[PDB]
């Protein structure tokens, strides 16, 4: 039962943006158009932009999982090492196995999927500020490198936007890859 990442903007015309951020040093995390892949640090802020044609109505939920990119690795949850699940790094908010979590919101909701065992974080959808997006700041807290966790698995990253009953109202997706230099990382993936 893997989960769909199927492209789908639907009825108010949903897709995904990030910020244009280069190949500095320096940067926090960069996304490659070309790669359709954000290349990010563990813990940093990783800014991921909502576009929509029309506001969805209010109850509208964001949600975010991670999946394994490969389909020999698909059926296999996407959770954090044992390192990072015993680390002491929590928020008090997200439970202690999650890969993403949301930054700087205090409605976070965080699911363990009874059936699947998936884990997923969940927003209340926020039109953009009077804006032409919603920013949403999300966290990875395992390395791509990570021993016992990704295990240099490449993951995707699947953002659906659900109305508050749970049903599609969109999907987009994107590759991810968290290590400790992203400008240079996708620079050098890039080359070729
Ligand atoms: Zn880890």
Redesign the pocket.
């Known amino acids: 039962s893997v989960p769909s990442q199927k492209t789908y903007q639907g009825s108010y015309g949903f897709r995904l943006g990030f910020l244009h951020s280069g190949t500095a040093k320096s940067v926090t995390c960069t996304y490659s158009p070309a790669l359709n892949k954000m290349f990010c640090q ?1 813990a940093k802020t990783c800014p991921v932009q909502l576009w929509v044609d029309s506001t969805p109505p209010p109850g509208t939920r964001v949600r975010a999982m991670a999946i394994y990119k490969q389909s020999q690795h698909m059926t296999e949850v996407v959770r ?2 044992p ?3 015993r ?1 002491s790094d929590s928020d008090g908010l997200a439970p202690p196995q999650h890969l993403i979590r949301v930054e700087g919101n205090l409605r976070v909701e965080y699911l363990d999927d009874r059936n699947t065992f998936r884990h997923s974080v969940v927003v209340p959808y926020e039109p953009p500020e009077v804006s032409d997006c919603t920013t949403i700041h999300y966290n990875y ?3 791509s490198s ?5 295990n240099r698995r490449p993951i995707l990253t699947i953002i659906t936007l659900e109305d508050s009953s749970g049903n599609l109202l969109g999907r987009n997706s994107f590759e991810v890859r968290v290590c400790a230099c992203p400008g240079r990382d996708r620079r050098t993936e890039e080359e070729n």
């Open positions: 563990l954090r090492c390192h990072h699940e680390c807290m395992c390395n990570c021993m016992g966790g990704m």
